[PDB]
């Protein structure tokens, strides 16, 4: 794919976007978990931004029959719109969800 | 302070502006002033606050499409 | 009949009946800077207008002569056989 | 080129406004007029570019607002609907500029006037060329700021300052609802770009489309002067005549119509708004046709005629035939501008008198003006084969063409509204040119007859026509008013025309009524408006010329006295707005200021705590008389109270009651 | 030393030089006024240096200094995107605030310059401190200089005006102190890094909310508690009015991003309908009574109450857009309210000695430069597009509608009512007829001083309106940290 | 018959000249000068915004899908 | 004119390759981890002192 | 510092941006019980 | 029943005519004569009709 930029190594998270198994009194590990979650939520919203830019070019390209040519892009944008918001880490940091 | 330009200060407007400034010194508690005060300070905020509580989290429009309902609750 | 007005009042738009005797020279100079400014926005347009459909070769479309996307297309299409 | 159409009117405005001293009246007029002439030529080319070739043009410059899910750019889209609007906007703006050189020649402040003209053209371009609803709102507000600046051009006149408050604030009411409507779009879809909103429109919650459509429609009343929020449009006749020709009757008033036409790929999926659009349209046509027939100001009549035509387009939008509403919009800005520039020409000739009761003859004195306004009045009534014939008469037969109760209703309502249009068109053309002279001899005293001996050199002033910069616009707009409808009937009416097949005007196959309007509608209803115009015109001419007593009988009857004053006073809508809405808000402000802020908030607060505590502290301070005998008694008293409290195991609350009792006893004097 | 401590020492160094120059020359007051102005410009150059180096996507506080020595009370300075623009606003205003009031003081000029140079340090500190007791320390250290600024250089009703501001701000801020002391008792420190990790029990949060909101409601201020501002701003000197509206009214706005959004989230969520009910009421009442105000400078002060309510509902939206719009509307209010105060308190009062709108009419005829700027600042007060005020209101209003729709619908009525009073004031002073007859002699138009501070303030309002990304790119990542909530498929990742 | 242009800018009558009050020096050189120097510096400020970082990752995720074309 | 000139000069180029000034500006404000290392030390100490303040203030009488 | 998810959902409740994993399925059950209508959003793609 | 003033609206409307004798008769006679006679006012109410009618007949005769 597109090469990973030099600016995209300095700010790339080194930790998974989670708080499970993170000692809070280790401030270094804690702030990086905060950063990891915020960066993921933001990649998700810019993923929808880019799909929306493609939708627009399919709209101005297909004109009248965009209703039968731009449906795949419409799916992806509507999926992302329901799932990506920047909600922060504060709720995530302060609650644990067992997933069981 | 600095000298200002000459203004034909109207004695009538000057005493009116003085009246507006000292007016509070003459407010009394009547049956009328209480009725207006109770309406504005209690009733309207309590009505706005009550609707704010009843409809709070009631609706969401994001990504809602046909076949879905606007009502969250 | 012209309105009497105060002559100490300075206005950027001239005031009451303001025409300088250098009006033509100043108007000429403002015309060039307008022409120069509108020349930069034109070259921006040419390189940044986006079309998803190119015009026909014989069909009247004067944009063909300055917009880069069309000029890239028509030059590429002028290579065949 | 495309981004240069946007930039030129802005630059001429800046030179005329901030640099008027350097260029002068002549230089400001030249730069302002030339920049909009050049823009007009570049826009006629863009019509061939975009529309005739089906090549939409997209250009984004930089981002305006950047957030989560919100990315609104300084971007512009040129499609078939954009170039369609640009032609009347820029042809009329160019001609009103050329016109205004003659009309505003004697005014002191020409640089400021011509600067506001170019500022309005720039804002109107921004409104129709934007990629998204939020940049279209910049032009919407911008046109509002420019209409306030031009209604209040003569700031010395108080009437003008009241009328500009009306224009500004009645349009802010519409802006509140568009802002709510754009919030709904961002809340539902995440972005308010046109491609986004229209691509996703078929799938959005049907009730979410109700909320957006109602908010878009309410905002559309204020600018399109529909009956609910229309009081401002006739008051905007305070500004100079060329302002009323472009802004108040040929461009800004149409923005509300453009908002619905642009939002066609969305509001088509809500038939609930389409009924409201349709009935909104039919009401305004009869509401304003009736009012204009009882007005005595020429500008007020031509302002109420415009709102009758704006009601026609909103009717067509709710009829779901957007190409018909766009056709009427472009055709109307040619003959409504003509009648206003022609009326402005007779106001100029007759010493700035605007009352029909003081105009008469003048047909021989202003031959070009009369014929040109006869050109305009025949297309205003949609006389066969005029420009307005193909636009207004297709709205009527399309209303009956939708074989529904609401359609047949609006056909009857609109046909009646057309009857009154023919009545006030005769009134204007008869009382200004064809009736006996009703004004002073000064307008009619020539030099062919000698009224003087030692002053023959001057002092006749007999209502002459203006100069080249005045007549030239009138001739051009006359040619449009005769032929433009025929030459463009296919681009807009057509039968399966593909001019708007880039989804600029989306009609849903469910709402198509074109084929029935071509074949189903009977010839009687198709021809019915024509007979009414020809029959009423002759009836009103006889009642105005041959039998003039009968109308005097009507207005001198108590029944007709009330009916004449009811429609002259504009349905009393102004009366009930000042008395129950405007004055109610000013009373509410006074009651909050007088009784709450300066009243109970200071009494149950700092001032009541001040006067209460100072009274209390003087009483306690009066217990201290510097008598050792009385101080000794106090120590014993305070000793016993401590002994009672810590030996009777009294509830601590019993103590606090004592303190509050004691403190409030020192609160009472004597 | 750090670069955030240089921000504080320079205004202190300027105080020293004004105090000692007479000991080297009987010195002119013009020399005292150049020292104070050069000192404020240097603070603005440092603050622009800080902004060049600042990392727009960093979750660690920047330009900090390793203390390594702990006492009971210790100054800890740091900068985050949430605070950088508040610092910049303080450093752009203070130079103009001095220039605006350059001729109007006349007596006690050293004292006047020393108080402003001292205020600049105290208001800069309140944004730079990384503890909540240190925040309170500077959020309330400004009350003694402001009591004496109004009393020494204020208008006729100055004594009562200065008593109102001090006593209301003292009373309201002592309920904040009780809440701060409780959090310190439960956690052991008020340093932000340690406090933001900690999660309080709901009941503790609901009582910490009652006490931070009481403080903020008095200092916003809300409608029934705004009497101090109607007195303070009007009777204050022009320079004090500029500081109190642009910078001091923003201390409560920036204090919600520290004291409420990150540490009391459940309380903020379950009590937002109380906040929105108050915020809605203060949008309507303030606006109705701004229409009937007859003192021009008090018409500018009342306008501030309506705007603060829009940004208060924006900070309580739990939305990224309403939170950034709240900061944008506070920055926008800082420029526009400064200009309208300069017009009312510094141009009309300078030439007439009156603030009554009865005496002003047709001022555009003799003062065409004043009317041009006055119109632009009135349009921004009305939230017209192309000004930063429109962007902040739109985002503040959208997050209000997304949180609890009904209250944002009432709050949206500010579009009709802010417009109503702004144009009505304008048409009555600039327009409204011919030049008044109460003016015996002609008034001069704008001076090169009056023109260039009005032009500077208008320039910031318009340029930032066109490209708000100058401020928006810095707040995005840091605003992301104060949102409370989860999404069902984006959270708890494995 | 247009009149000559008129007026006194800054209230300076046609006889004399503008007298520098004192503020002008620092405000034109220091206040405004700092903003132009800040403006030219801001052009070379590296872009550390979250979006420039999030766009590039987002493109690399959508490139892994048919949504965005990859140059490889 | 200056804005057009300054903007033209300060652009990066065809594909990456920042200019010398861009290199200088990014170099001076590097701070690769020195904000993190100093914040972590300070957070660790102020967290210790909170434990200490609780130990000394909640001791058995 | 952290608490059970159930503990917080008791004081604030799901909704108002607090969409815990499983919010949509529960909302369907909640909406079906109160409104008597099954939620079934439309596809938005003519293909699949 | 009649008012103290001699005003009756039925009689008022009866006199809404052109009076037989008028003291101002000659002062107003210019508005109904010359350019302002019935014919002159409507002589050119349809400006181009006369030129167009004969011109259109010339085009209409195209059979020959
Ligand atoms: C760009 C056009 C700028 C025009 C400025 C005209 C001017 O200098 O007026 C001075 C004029 C005076 O120019 P003047 O030449 O008529 O002066 C003659 C003498 N007196 C002073 C008596 C009039 O003063 C005004 O009337 C000022 C009123 C405010 C004008 C505001 C114009 C800009 C509005 C921007 C709208 C933005 C909307 C965004 C959405
Ligand atoms: C009535 C309006 C009159 C306007 C007069 C002033 C016109 C200014 C024209 C500026 C043209 C900038 C051209 C930039 C091309 C795009 C390159 C780029 O990325 O620049 C970054 C920034 C944002 O632009 P971008 O992210 O690309 O937004 C998407 C739409 N293209 O783009 C920028 O560099 C913009 C930063 C400054 C914007 C202007 C702010 C002051 C005005
Ligand atoms: C002063 C105070 C901001 C203003 C308010 C927001 C805009 C309006 C919001 C209310 C309407 C939207 C929610 C309606 C919910 C609902 O279930 O209504 C359904 C109904 C239409 O149902 P149906 O015909 O089945 O839908 C189309 C199917 N093909 O929908 C209806 O029939 C709705 C009823 C008609 C509404 C017309 C407009 C009313 C305006 C009231 C004043 C607003 C100010
Ligand atoms: C007399 C006083 C007039 C005051 C008002 C003036 C308004 C226009 C001001 C001039 C606009 C261009 C000059 C802007 C200076 C800043 C330069 C800049 O940021 O880029 C401007 C851009 C030129 O960039 P360019 O060289 O074309 O880059 C690609 C080259 N391959 O060029 C452009 O981006 C052109 C687009 C500008 C915006 C056009 C209108 C869009 C918004 C409406
Ligand atoms: C943009 C700012 C404003 C946005 C927020 C306001 C949105 C208003 C949404 C109103 C509709 C909400 O969702 C609506 O609720 C009503 C009940 O009230 C219900 O309406 C239902 O009524 C009957 C029962 O009486 C059902 O058989 C029918 O299927 C449906 O119409 C549905 O659940 C839904 O149509
Ligand atoms: C929430 C409720 C309120 C919270 C707390 C706010 C309390 C504010 C109370 C301030 C009361 C006013 O305080 C008092 O005002 C009067 C003016 O009337 C001042 O009195 C002064 O002004 C008068 C004005 O005529 C002059 O004669 C003279 O300068 C002096 O006597 C007092 O020096 C001051 O102490
Ligand atoms: C939005 C409202 C916010 C309010 C916040 C809290 C404000 C302070 C609350 C207490 C205010 C003091 O309230 C005030 O106390 C004194 C008591 O001597 C009274 O003051 C007055 O009492 C009577 C009037 O009834 C007078 O004859 C007397 O001269 C005077 O002392 C007022 O009756 C009361 O209004
Ligand atoms: C915590 C307490 C509250 C702190 C609030 C901040 C207060 C700041 C006050 C500034 C310091 C005092 O300011 C001081 O004013 C006196 C006025 O008598 C000046 O003293 C001099 O003033 C003028 C100068 O021409 C002389 O006419 C006068 O005779 C002389 O006393 C000092 O030169 C100045 O330094
Ligand atoms: C206006 C004046 C309003 C009253 C003053 C504020 C009262 C606040 O006092 C409040 O009282 C309740 C009663 O237990 C306590 O609140 C909390 O206490 C402990 C926590 O340590 C919990 O076990 C208890 O369940 C909880 O209610 C706190 O002490 C305090 O939050």
mmCIF file of N, CA and C in Angstrom, chain D residues 18 62-64 66-68 70 74 134 137-138 141 145 148 155-156 161 165 168-169 172-173 176 179-180 183 186-187 586 589-590 592-593 596-597 601-602 606-607 610, chain E residues 160 164 223-224 231 288-289 292 302 320-321 364-365 372 382 384-386 394-395 397-398 402 405 412 415 419-420 423 426-427 431-433 465-469 472-473 476:
data_model
loop_
_atom_site.group_PDB
_atom_site.id
_atom_site.type_symbol
_atom_site.label_atom_id
_atom_site.label_comp_id
_atom_site.label_asym_id
_atom_site.label_seq_id
_atom_site.Cartn_x
_atom_site.Cartn_y
_atom_site.Cartn_z
ATOM 1 N N UNK D 18 -13.765 51.072 -0.403
ATOM 2 C CA UNK D 18 -12.625 51.489 0.392
ATOM 3 C C UNK D 18 -11.682 52.410 -0.364
ATOM 4 N N UNK D 62 -10.053 25.742 -0.063
ATOM 5 C CA UNK D 62 -9.524 25.276 1.209
ATOM 6 C C UNK D 62 -10.707 24.984 2.111
ATOM 7 N N UNK D 63 -10.416 24.422 3.276
ATOM 8 C CA UNK D 63 -11.469 24.078 4.213
ATOM 9 C C UNK D 63 -11.911 25.305 4.988
ATOM 10 N N UNK D 64 -13.205 25.370 5.270
ATOM 11 C CA UNK D 64 -13.738 26.403 6.143
ATOM 12 C C UNK D 64 -13.820 25.898 7.581
ATOM 13 N N UNK D 66 -13.535 22.498 10.101
ATOM 14 C CA UNK D 66 -12.925 21.174 10.164
ATOM 15 C C UNK D 66 -13.096 20.621 11.569
ATOM 16 N N UNK D 67 -13.836 19.524 11.696
ATOM 17 C CA UNK D 67 -14.084 18.906 12.994
ATOM 18 C C UNK D 67 -14.265 17.406 12.792
ATOM 19 N N UNK D 68 -14.823 16.743 13.793
ATOM 20 C CA UNK D 68 -15.214 15.350 13.626
ATOM 21 C C UNK D 68 -16.467 15.282 12.767
ATOM 22 N N UNK D 70 -17.405 16.787 10.430
ATOM 23 C CA UNK D 70 -17.739 18.069 9.825
ATOM 24 C C UNK D 70 -16.537 18.541 9.022
ATOM 25 N N UNK D 74 -14.519 25.757 1.321
ATOM 26 C CA UNK D 74 -14.750 26.896 0.438
ATOM 27 C C UNK D 74 -14.773 26.407 -1.012
ATOM 28 N N UNK D 134 -23.893 25.137 4.189
ATOM 29 C CA UNK D 134 -23.343 26.143 5.087
ATOM 30 C C UNK D 134 -22.668 27.281 4.334
ATOM 31 N N UNK D 137 -25.478 29.350 3.018
ATOM 32 C CA UNK D 137 -25.956 30.245 4.097
ATOM 33 C C UNK D 137 -25.126 31.539 4.147
ATOM 34 N N UNK D 138 -23.844 31.501 3.803
ATOM 35 C CA UNK D 138 -23.020 32.742 3.748
ATOM 36 C C UNK D 138 -23.610 33.716 2.727
ATOM 37 N N UNK D 141 -27.128 35.027 4.211
ATOM 38 C CA UNK D 141 -26.901 36.131 5.172
ATOM 39 C C UNK D 141 -26.298 37.342 4.468
ATOM 40 N N UNK D 145 -27.532 41.202 4.525
ATOM 41 C CA UNK D 145 -26.726 42.371 4.990
ATOM 42 C C UNK D 145 -26.715 43.433 3.893
ATOM 43 N N UNK D 148 -30.166 45.167 3.718
ATOM 44 C CA UNK D 148 -30.232 46.166 4.779
ATOM 45 C C UNK D 148 -29.430 47.405 4.412
ATOM 46 N N UNK D 155 -29.907 56.977 5.152
ATOM 47 C CA UNK D 155 -30.047 56.758 6.619
ATOM 48 C C UNK D 155 -30.753 57.923 7.324
ATOM 49 N N UNK D 156 -30.733 59.111 6.725
ATOM 50 C CA UNK D 156 -31.372 60.306 7.335
ATOM 51 C C UNK D 156 -32.880 60.070 7.492
ATOM 52 N N UNK D 161 -35.206 53.544 7.970
ATOM 53 C CA UNK D 161 -34.502 52.842 9.068
ATOM 54 C C UNK D 161 -35.468 51.850 9.694
ATOM 55 N N UNK D 165 -34.934 47.610 9.352
ATOM 56 C CA UNK D 165 -35.078 46.728 10.505
ATOM 57 C C UNK D 165 -36.015 45.578 10.168
ATOM 58 N N UNK D 168 -34.202 43.080 7.847
ATOM 59 C CA UNK D 168 -33.127 42.365 8.522
ATOM 60 C C UNK D 168 -33.664 41.313 9.483
ATOM 61 N N UNK D 169 -34.677 41.660 10.274
ATOM 62 C CA UNK D 169 -35.138 40.790 11.347
ATOM 63 C C UNK D 169 -36.172 39.777 10.901
ATOM 64 N N UNK D 172 -33.975 37.156 9.569
ATOM 65 C CA UNK D 172 -33.285 36.411 10.662
ATOM 66 C C UNK D 172 -34.196 35.318 11.217
ATOM 67 N N UNK D 173 -35.515 35.534 11.230
ATOM 68 C CA UNK D 173 -36.485 34.492 11.664
ATOM 69 C C UNK D 173 -36.370 33.281 10.737
ATOM 70 N N UNK D 176 -33.062 31.447 11.515
ATOM 71 C CA UNK D 176 -33.120 30.573 12.708
ATOM 72 C C UNK D 176 -33.602 29.186 12.289
ATOM 73 N N UNK D 179 -30.992 27.342 10.249
ATOM 74 C CA UNK D 179 -29.928 26.884 11.130
ATOM 75 C C UNK D 179 -30.349 25.618 11.867
ATOM 76 N N UNK D 180 -31.609 25.555 12.295
ATOM 77 C CA UNK D 180 -32.149 24.328 12.870
ATOM 78 C C UNK D 180 -32.205 23.227 11.821
ATOM 79 N N UNK D 183 -28.760 21.934 11.254
ATOM 80 C CA UNK D 183 -28.370 21.102 12.388
ATOM 81 C C UNK D 183 -28.923 19.696 12.242
ATOM 82 N N UNK D 186 -26.773 17.789 9.650
ATOM 83 C CA UNK D 186 -25.521 17.351 10.263
ATOM 84 C C UNK D 186 -25.764 16.244 11.275
ATOM 85 N N UNK D 187 -26.839 16.334 12.059
ATOM 86 C CA UNK D 187 -27.158 15.323 13.098
ATOM 87 C C UNK D 187 -27.498 13.984 12.445
ATOM 88 N N UNK D 586 -41.277 44.172 23.394
ATOM 89 C CA UNK D 586 -40.717 45.354 24.035
ATOM 90 C C UNK D 586 -41.291 45.561 25.429
ATOM 91 N N UNK D 589 -39.308 42.987 27.593
ATOM 92 C CA UNK D 589 -38.006 43.513 27.952
ATOM 93 C C UNK D 589 -38.080 44.530 29.071
ATOM 94 N N UNK D 590 -39.093 45.396 29.034
ATOM 95 C CA UNK D 590 -39.253 46.378 30.091
ATOM 96 C C UNK D 590 -39.590 45.760 31.433
ATOM 97 N N UNK D 592 -38.849 42.729 32.524
ATOM 98 C CA UNK D 592 -37.653 42.094 33.061
ATOM 99 C C UNK D 592 -36.697 43.143 33.610
ATOM 100 N N UNK D 593 -36.511 44.240 32.878
ATOM 101 C CA UNK D 593 -35.596 45.284 33.323
ATOM 102 C C UNK D 593 -36.132 46.007 34.550
ATOM 103 N N UNK D 596 -37.722 42.940 37.444
ATOM 104 C CA UNK D 596 -36.877 41.822 37.918
ATOM 105 C C UNK D 596 -35.453 42.303 38.129
ATOM 106 N N UNK D 597 -34.768 42.730 37.068
ATOM 107 C CA UNK D 597 -33.326 43.091 37.171
ATOM 108 C C UNK D 597 -33.112 44.244 38.135
ATOM 109 N N UNK D 601 -34.676 41.240 41.936
ATOM 110 C CA UNK D 601 -33.391 40.508 41.947
ATOM 111 C C UNK D 601 -32.463 41.303 42.871
ATOM 112 N N UNK D 602 -32.654 42.623 42.938
ATOM 113 C CA UNK D 602 -31.839 43.406 43.855
ATOM 114 C C UNK D 602 -32.454 43.461 45.248
ATOM 115 N N UNK D 606 -28.527 41.658 46.723
ATOM 116 C CA UNK D 606 -27.544 42.541 47.374
ATOM 117 C C UNK D 606 -28.156 43.734 48.083
ATOM 118 N N UNK D 607 -29.164 44.371 47.491
ATOM 119 C CA UNK D 607 -29.714 45.580 48.088
ATOM 120 C C UNK D 607 -30.566 45.259 49.309
ATOM 121 N N UNK D 610 -28.140 44.306 51.998
ATOM 122 C CA UNK D 610 -27.497 45.511 52.509
ATOM 123 C C UNK D 610 -28.369 46.219 53.535
ATOM 124 N N UNK E 160 -20.067 51.520 44.232
ATOM 125 C CA UNK E 160 -20.985 50.391 44.287
ATOM 126 C C UNK E 160 -20.610 49.329 43.264
ATOM 127 N N UNK E 164 -19.767 45.412 44.211
ATOM 128 C CA UNK E 164 -20.515 44.301 43.636
ATOM 129 C C UNK E 164 -19.597 43.232 43.070
ATOM 130 N N UNK E 223 -28.456 34.697 34.367
ATOM 131 C CA UNK E 223 -29.386 35.860 34.443
ATOM 132 C C UNK E 223 -29.678 36.441 35.839
ATOM 133 N N UNK E 224 -30.088 35.656 36.833
ATOM 134 C CA UNK E 224 -30.474 36.308 38.098
ATOM 135 C C UNK E 224 -29.280 36.685 38.951
ATOM 136 N N UNK E 231 -22.950 46.471 36.624
ATOM 137 C CA UNK E 231 -22.269 47.580 37.321
ATOM 138 C C UNK E 231 -20.773 47.577 36.972
ATOM 139 N N UNK E 288 -34.109 39.997 25.973
ATOM 140 C CA UNK E 288 -35.267 40.885 26.026
ATOM 141 C C UNK E 288 -34.922 42.193 26.718
ATOM 142 N N UNK E 289 -34.121 42.124 27.777
ATOM 143 C CA UNK E 289 -33.758 43.316 28.524
ATOM 144 C C UNK E 289 -32.548 44.031 27.947
ATOM 145 N N UNK E 292 -34.117 46.981 25.773
ATOM 146 C CA UNK E 292 -34.667 48.157 26.429
ATOM 147 C C UNK E 292 -33.651 48.894 27.290
ATOM 148 N N UNK E 302 -24.681 43.676 28.645
ATOM 149 C CA UNK E 302 -25.826 42.732 28.637
ATOM 150 C C UNK E 302 -25.674 41.747 27.485
ATOM 151 N N UNK E 320 -17.968 16.776 20.576
ATOM 152 C CA UNK E 320 -16.665 17.353 20.162
ATOM 153 C C UNK E 320 -16.955 18.711 19.544
ATOM 154 N N UNK E 321 -18.085 18.852 18.839
ATOM 155 C CA UNK E 321 -18.346 20.085 18.106
ATOM 156 C C UNK E 321 -18.752 21.220 19.030
ATOM 157 N N UNK E 364 -23.052 58.599 11.550
ATOM 158 C CA UNK E 364 -22.336 58.180 10.310
ATOM 159 C C UNK E 364 -22.036 59.400 9.447
ATOM 160 N N UNK E 365 -22.876 60.420 9.519
ATOM 161 C CA UNK E 365 -22.743 61.629 8.681
ATOM 162 C C UNK E 365 -21.427 62.356 8.957
ATOM 163 N N UNK E 372 -18.222 52.537 10.018
ATOM 164 C CA UNK E 372 -17.855 51.332 9.284
ATOM 165 C C UNK E 372 -17.420 50.225 10.234
ATOM 166 N N UNK E 382 -23.941 39.971 16.286
ATOM 167 C CA UNK E 382 -25.129 39.274 15.755
ATOM 168 C C UNK E 382 -24.791 37.907 15.155
ATOM 169 N N UNK E 384 -22.969 37.049 12.383
ATOM 170 C CA UNK E 384 -23.071 37.014 10.907
ATOM 171 C C UNK E 384 -21.951 36.121 10.390
ATOM 172 N N UNK E 385 -22.140 35.321 9.324
ATOM 173 C CA UNK E 385 -21.053 34.534 8.745
ATOM 174 C C UNK E 385 -19.873 35.391 8.271
ATOM 175 N N UNK E 386 -18.677 34.805 8.124
ATOM 176 C CA UNK E 386 -17.421 35.526 7.747
ATOM 177 C C UNK E 386 -16.790 36.115 9.003
ATOM 178 N N UNK E 394 -22.545 28.429 15.831
ATOM 179 C CA UNK E 394 -23.117 27.296 15.071
ATOM 180 C C UNK E 394 -22.732 25.974 15.729
ATOM 181 N N UNK E 395 -21.453 25.812 16.058
ATOM 182 C CA UNK E 395 -20.959 24.572 16.705
ATOM 183 C C UNK E 395 -21.471 24.475 18.144
ATOM 184 N N UNK E 397 -24.243 25.709 19.174
ATOM 185 C CA UNK E 397 -25.709 25.500 19.111
ATOM 186 C C UNK E 397 -25.994 24.083 18.637
ATOM 187 N N UNK E 398 -25.101 23.518 17.827
ATOM 188 C CA UNK E 398 -25.374 22.170 17.281
ATOM 189 C C UNK E 398 -25.175 21.145 18.388
ATOM 190 N N UNK E 402 -27.872 18.465 19.817
ATOM 191 C CA UNK E 402 -27.583 17.007 19.811
ATOM 192 C C UNK E 402 -27.683 16.442 21.235
ATOM 193 N N UNK E 405 -32.212 18.214 22.472
ATOM 194 C CA UNK E 405 -32.768 19.056 21.411
ATOM 195 C C UNK E 405 -33.619 20.266 21.802
ATOM 196 N N UNK E 412 -31.381 28.516 20.007
ATOM 197 C CA UNK E 412 -31.230 28.956 18.628
ATOM 198 C C UNK E 412 -31.954 30.263 18.354
ATOM 199 N N UNK E 415 -30.431 33.734 17.433
ATOM 200 C CA UNK E 415 -30.089 34.191 16.056
ATOM 201 C C UNK E 415 -30.996 35.380 15.739
ATOM 202 N N UNK E 419 -29.472 39.540 16.784
ATOM 203 C CA UNK E 419 -29.627 40.412 15.629
ATOM 204 C C UNK E 419 -30.489 41.619 15.968
ATOM 205 N N UNK E 420 -31.552 41.405 16.746
ATOM 206 C CA UNK E 420 -32.503 42.476 17.018
ATOM 207 C C UNK E 420 -31.840 43.648 17.728
ATOM 208 N N UNK E 423 -28.564 45.453 15.585
ATOM 209 C CA UNK E 423 -28.983 46.379 14.501
ATOM 210 C C UNK E 423 -29.729 47.567 15.102
ATOM 211 N N UNK E 426 -27.314 49.862 16.495
ATOM 212 C CA UNK E 426 -26.577 50.461 15.363
ATOM 213 C C UNK E 426 -27.429 51.546 14.710
ATOM 214 N N UNK E 427 -28.654 51.208 14.310
ATOM 215 C CA UNK E 427 -29.521 52.177 13.654
ATOM 216 C C UNK E 427 -29.840 53.381 14.522
ATOM 217 N N UNK E 431 -27.106 55.587 12.434
ATOM 218 C CA UNK E 431 -28.202 55.929 11.547
ATOM 219 C C UNK E 431 -29.306 56.527 12.403
ATOM 220 N N UNK E 432 -30.532 56.509 11.916
ATOM 221 C CA UNK E 432 -31.652 56.916 12.784
ATOM 222 C C UNK E 432 -32.062 58.339 12.566
ATOM 223 N N UNK E 433 -31.529 58.945 11.519
ATOM 224 C CA UNK E 433 -31.822 60.351 11.278
ATOM 225 C C UNK E 433 -30.550 61.097 11.046
ATOM 226 N N UNK E 465 -12.586 34.057 11.180
ATOM 227 C CA UNK E 465 -13.853 33.562 10.672
ATOM 228 C C UNK E 465 -13.708 32.812 9.364
ATOM 229 N N UNK E 466 -12.834 33.291 8.482
ATOM 230 C CA UNK E 466 -12.635 32.640 7.191
ATOM 231 C C UNK E 466 -11.935 31.301 7.368
ATOM 232 N N UNK E 467 -10.862 31.276 8.146
ATOM 233 C CA UNK E 467 -10.048 30.078 8.330
ATOM 234 C C UNK E 467 -9.944 29.766 9.814
ATOM 235 N N UNK E 468 -11.015 29.238 10.413
ATOM 236 C CA UNK E 468 -10.965 28.883 11.837
ATOM 237 C C UNK E 468 -10.045 27.721 12.135
ATOM 238 N N UNK E 469 -9.501 27.066 11.115
ATOM 239 C CA UNK E 469 -8.578 25.963 11.314
ATOM 240 C C UNK E 469 -7.270 26.409 11.943
ATOM 241 N N UNK E 472 -8.647 25.575 15.256
ATOM 242 C CA UNK E 472 -9.303 24.276 15.370
ATOM 243 C C UNK E 472 -8.309 23.121 15.346
ATOM 244 N N UNK E 473 -7.212 23.252 14.596
ATOM 245 C CA UNK E 473 -6.246 22.163 14.522
ATOM 246 C C UNK E 473 -5.526 21.949 15.845
ATOM 247 N N UNK E 476 -8.333 19.923 18.565
ATOM 248 C CA UNK E 476 -8.933 18.593 18.244
ATOM 249 C C UNK E 476 -8.534 17.465 19.201
#
